Amino acid sequence: PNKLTLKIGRAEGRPGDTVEIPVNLYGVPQKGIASGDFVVSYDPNVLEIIEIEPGELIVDPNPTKSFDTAVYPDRKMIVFLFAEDSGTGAYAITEDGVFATIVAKVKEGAPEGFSAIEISEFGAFADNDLVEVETDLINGGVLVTNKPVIEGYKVSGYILPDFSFDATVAPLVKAGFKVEIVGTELYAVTDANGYFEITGVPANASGYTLKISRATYLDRVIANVVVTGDTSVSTSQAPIMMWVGDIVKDNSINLLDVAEVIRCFNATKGSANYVEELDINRNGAINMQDIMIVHKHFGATSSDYDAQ
């Protein structure tokens, strides 16, 4: 209604989180509010009151002079006092809005659920002529959730090495692709299933650019990944393929690359000439079959991949 209304707000957090519950005044008369008092109750086994910041509504250049609180956790209460301190009505509340912000930590062992903060005792509010004003009260409180809240969206997908290999060895060939979001410090590395997920990605509907990279691999660039919520760039049954054989990193697969494998030709696991990343298919030796993998994309440069 158009009458005066005191309202405890609401908020939510995980245990351990600090939260702010506002206390609002609605229906503040032309004449102004010059004074109020009331008690608010709560559950100290769930919320620990840090402090109570005076609201924007409190306009004394030193709000603490006009506005006061006492927290009594053993009594399970908070007393609120407002007495416009100018003594001339100069600091009366004259607008609807925030009267105070309760600041609380949700205790670490708090139950999930909704914890009520209720106006439990009421004194008075009065206008700038010091005439008491009928007030309407509305409770609130905190929703204690165990749902983890996030820094934003999840970009994820699947990457596959484009070449045959023995299942037993997939864990190795599939892990270790670094996907990074260009222009930022966000990246992720694939797991043994070729799956990556970058978390905490700020919304961006203009699109990001992804850069997939790995030793011995031809760097790939995915442009125009628009993020308006969690995004999946690729799916397991249809991964992003990665071409191997950029051994001398220059974004071309050519003689210089094949040359490096040949320098280790016929080496075996334990052999001195051996070099795991050069055993392309991780079968225990470096031989013509490795070189043939590289030949799959002989002459290729990064630009040669597809844009999508």
Added chain:
Amino acid sequence: HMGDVNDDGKVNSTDLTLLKRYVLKAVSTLPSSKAEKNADVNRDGRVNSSDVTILSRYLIRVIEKLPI
């Protein structure tokens, strides 16, 4: 009724604000003879910025009983 500065049978934030105004002499008079008496919360004869502080602190419940 120690503290009922406006003599309405309650002790609340309204008393404290009126009291602040009285002590400033921004309002000339408390509503009654009892009022003036109620206003002297430390029973010290004078009615001034000490009463204001005391009443202020009783309302916040930092002080259990008034007349002190």
Added chain:
Amino acid sequence: ASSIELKFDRNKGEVGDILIGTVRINNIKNFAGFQVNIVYDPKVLMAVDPETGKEFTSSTFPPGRTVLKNNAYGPIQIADNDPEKGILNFALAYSYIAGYKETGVAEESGIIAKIGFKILQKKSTAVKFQDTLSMPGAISGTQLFDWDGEVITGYEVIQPDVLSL
């Protein structure tokens, strides 16, 4: 049928004579490369270029082939012999296997090597294709590849008959 074969030209000979082993492939589909591992007894035989009689070294690549000579696809040769232990090991492949595949015509039968063995003794001796640690998953010391870069299987490996006296 489908095979890789090492035949010799002569069943017997005299100390200092040069037997000519020929390695050839028969009906390998989309053939584009190979690696082979041949063994012989170095105390009885000496691996030798069948045309200059020079002794093979670690890097000597056997001549003679009639396949994979189309330079538009960038053939490469790799030799890794160990004649002191009686091991021949060499490979050949097209580089640009795509352009090769792009054209459809596959080179499926022909000669890949010719090796001379210079007789060192009138003892009875064998030369075999044979597995090696350098080629895991290979079929008896042989690995053949198609124009997809994939290893080929299901071909017969046909060893030469023993060499007598």
